[PDB]
């Protein structure tokens, strides 16, 4: 049979949330910036031999509308927390997402993956070690991705599914 997972992609404006999602869904890289209000996608995949339906909620980077954002977090089962490796502010924003997720879901252990996107670019401002150290302090995986080259895209989403499954085993 199969299972279904509600994945929520969060992160600051322009980090590549939609580009990552569109690579997963449509297998092409959106070169242009089309700022998101809200979009949802579905994809059937096999992860670790187990078929599942991924429900992906692609959120806007904006952080107003707390009622809507709280609802995203209540319904979501796992969170892709995306920053861009050439945007230090977006990396500094990460802890706010983790704190808001822990608060809304009333738990210190919520399935999450830290994603450092745009790794194809030569303009890095956030060191891999810096992001690895942050992910270690949360006890979550860290994955470097490029939506442009597709590097790490499947890995980021599949790892998030593994994190949900590990959480459900507890």
């Amino acid at each position: 049979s199969m299972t279904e997972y509600k994945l929520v992609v969060v992160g600051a404006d322009g980090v590549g949330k939609s580009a990552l999602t569109i690579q997963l869904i449509q297998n092409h890289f959106v070169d242009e910036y089309d700022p998101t209000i809200e979009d949802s996608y579905r994809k059937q995949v096999v992860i670790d031999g187990e078929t599942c339906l991924l429900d992906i909620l692609d959120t806007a980077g904006q952080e107003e509308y707390s009622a809507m954002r709280d609802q995203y977090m209540r319904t979501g089962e796992g969170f892709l927390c995306v920053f861009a490796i050439n945007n230090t502010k977006s990396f500094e924003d990460i802890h706010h997402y983790r704190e808001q997720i822990k608060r809304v879901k009333d738990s210190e252990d919520v399935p999450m993956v830290l994603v450092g996107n745009k790794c194809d670019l030569p303009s890095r401002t956030v060191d891999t070690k810096q992001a690895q150290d942050l992910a270690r302090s949360y006890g979550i995986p860290f994955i470097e991705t490029s939506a442009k080259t597709r590097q790490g895209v499947d890995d980021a989403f599949y790892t998030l599914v593994r994190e949900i499954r590990k959480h459900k085993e507890k």
């Binding site: 910036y33 089309d34 209000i37 809200e38 979009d39 107003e64």
Partner: protein, 166 residues
């Protein structure tokens, strides 16, 4: 009106005439921001709104447009440079028809703007209100129907013509 200029947009839906919306621009209270929108409506600086798209329309909230530089919802520019500061927050988002500047945070006004179709008071103090629909609110309501929850429009809504009414 004895003081505030009036400008118009002739709105098109996939190139076809929908109708005219006119705006009173509150130069009496928001002169720099009103003057930017006026000049962009006449095109007198060599650029402006003519031909641009209402790219984001969300029923119950607003019709947003004004990106004539990138044509994708991320751009626009003012008559003062790429961006200009928030002039004042004297006026508030009190109901349908309010004309207010879109932005990307403090002091990032360019040319993008929105027409409220409802009271949007949570934007007070963050977006500079500078005008209101004078005639053609029915046309704004017609435009609103082409929008959707995520802002995407079912037909292309453009400013086919624009200018100043004396």
């Amino acid at each position: 009106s004895m003081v505030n200029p009036t400008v118009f947009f002739d709105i098109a839906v996939d190139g076809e005439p929908l109708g005219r919306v006119s705006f009173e621009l509150f130069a009496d209270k928001v002169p720099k921001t009103a003057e930017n929108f006026r000049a962009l409506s006449t095109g007198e600086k060599g650029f402006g709104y003519k031909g641009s798209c209402f790219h984001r329309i969300i029923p119950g909230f607003m019709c947003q447009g004004g990106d004539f530089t990138r044509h994708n919802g991320t751009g626009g520019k003012s008559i003062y440079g790429e961006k200009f500061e928030d002039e004042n927050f004297i006026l508030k988002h009190t109901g349908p028809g309010i004309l207010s500047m879109a932005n990307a945070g403090p002091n990032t006004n360019g040319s993008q703007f929105f027409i409220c179709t409802a009271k949007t008071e949570w934007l007070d103090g963050k977006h500079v209100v500078f005008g209101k629909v004078k005639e053609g609110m029915n046309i704004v309501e017609a435009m609103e129907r082409f929008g959707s929850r995520n802002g995407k429009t079912s037909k292309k809504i453009t400013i086919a013509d624009c200018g100043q009414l004396e």
